[model samples]
Target: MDIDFSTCARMDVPILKKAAQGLCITSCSMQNCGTGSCKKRSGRPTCVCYRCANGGGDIPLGALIKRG
Candidate 1:
């Protein structure tokens, strides 16, 4: 994919997983791994662009809000 990413790297994140596997942009729609929608049955959760938000400490990947 033609990943511009606004010029990539607020932290790069491995160039956004190689630009979402080169625009394959794996599911959970728009890559949302907010720690709320991935049971791995249908919403998908194999590698949503290296799911991060809280448990990973990088911020982005849906910006986790599960504070409990």
Candidate 2:
């Protein structure tokens, strides 16, 4: 399967920290701003793009985080 995140917003750090454990983030994007909120505020809630070696589907970052 193939995955792409070019259209998604950047993921948050804490969420990324957790997702990194179970999922491998194939690619990521970073940004800097002065006034307005970052990508998470305007774009989708999540910030990662990944896929399985066999096959998988796209999902939001918030939907993928682990809860305990």
Candidate 3:
């Protein structure tokens, strides 16, 4: 079960930027969500790229936080 955050890139959050540093890079692995899909899960924020994105979709930019 995953949370849907496809709207991640639509708003562009602020706190999420620094919080996800070295986490989910907007440029993919560079650690920035503004470059990709900036979304949230439950209460946390994250970025979506081909590397950690849903295999068949995009919702869990509201996803990933494992030193990735």
Candidate 4:
């Protein structure tokens, strides 16, 4: 995939867009949360969603913790 991360903000597809759901960018990009946490959310982070769910693409939520 030769996608430009900076130019990927045009589309409204949340599959590769999890920064709007409420998960930490790092966790969403590295968390093994392959569970069902993606409910009732517009762009929920499924698991390790850097590529599939543009982790840092969405607007940053203030103060996200819990690193591993």
Candidate 5:
């Protein structure tokens, strides 16, 4: 998915959750760094997105902790 993370507010859980659901595992840290965690929440395997510097992109939760 091509979401613009810079525009969304930090408290926008619904929007963020929707974006997470659309994300592809290939582009996400789950595939690249192999550090992200996925869970079947709300009937789907979703990776939590962590905000990166400069608002460049969103990092996977586990990836952020590993190398943040």
Candidate 6:
């Protein structure tokens, strides 16, 4: 009957501040598309973004090609 390290350090201080803010969340998307796709027609939301030392230099399409 002896377990009270300051009540588990105040219940782990907000779960360690939400696990250190999820270890500073950082991530991106669009890991797949097509042979230069993102083909929206009229409106917009597909102004794609890719750069592996300039892969879209010629502008063929949203070329991901395994990390463009």
Candidate 2 residues 12-33, lDDT tens each? 4544544432233433211111
Question: What is the Cα root-mean-square deviation between model 1 and the actual structure?
Answer: 12.1
Give per-model TM-scores.
0.17, 0.23, 0.27, 0.16, 0.24, 0.20
Candidate 3: what lDDT?
0.41
Q: Which has the greatest lDDT?
A: 3
- All models: lDDT? 0.32, 0.32, 0.41, 0.32, 0.40, 0.28
Q: Write down the RMSD of all candidates, one decimal each.
A: 12.1, 12.9, 8.3, 10.9, 10.5, 18.2
Among all candidates shown, the one with the greatest TM-score: 3
Q: Per-residue lDDT for 1-68 in model 4, tens only?
A: 12122222223555654553334334444433221122333443222233323243332221123331
lDDT of 3 by residue, 1-68 (tens): 23333234333555454544323344443323233445565655444565433342342333443344
Candidate 4 segments exceeding 4 Å error: 1-18, 22-26, 35-68
Lowest-scoring 10 consecutive residues by lDDT in candidate 6? 1-10
- lDDT for model 1, on a 0 to 1 scale? 0.32
State candidate 5's TM-score: 0.24
What does the lDDT read for residue 36 in candidate 2?
Answer: 16
Candidate 4 has its poorest 10 consecutive residues by lDDT at: 1-10
* Tens digit of per-residue lDDT, candidate 1, span 1-68: 22323322222354554443432233222444332221122433322233433343233333432332
Q: Which regions of candidate 3 fall more than 4 Å away from where they truly are? A: 1-26, 29-35, 50-68
**Worst lDDT window (10 residues) for model 3?**
1-10
